Design a protein around this ligand. Sequence first.
Ligand code: QX0
Length: 133
Amino acid sequence: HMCDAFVGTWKLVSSENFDDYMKEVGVGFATRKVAGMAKPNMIISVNGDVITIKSESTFKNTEISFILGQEFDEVTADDRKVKSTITLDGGVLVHVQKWDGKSTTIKRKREDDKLVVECVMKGVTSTRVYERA
Ligand SMILES: N#Cc1cccc(Nc2ccccc2C(=O)O)c1
């Protein structure tokens, strides 16, 4: 019953500062424009200790499966090859990506009937609000 409140199919309903967050990450112009137009669905499921998170949109469909606390390799939607570790910290899923001596942290939290995603790169934060689909 690890992660029960996250499981489901979620749809993006608002975004703030996502272009700036992508700039800080190093995403190029054309990817930023196309990616920023997307209204992804995030589909979260759990089977034993394995969590799966799918992101589907007109831009890209990606999928990660992982065990909490156990590093894995991830190819991001913008084609970074990163080393990822996802943990639960006080009810928040905390996803750290490392690549080329850089780091970004993506937090996912349940707040009321929403799933709130905070993406942080250095001083720049983007907030992405999802609702149940
Ligand atoms: N291209 C591209 C790109 C680059 C960085 C992050 C993301 N998207 C996300 C990642 C993680 C969680 C939620 C989102 C989300 O879209 O809400 C897309």
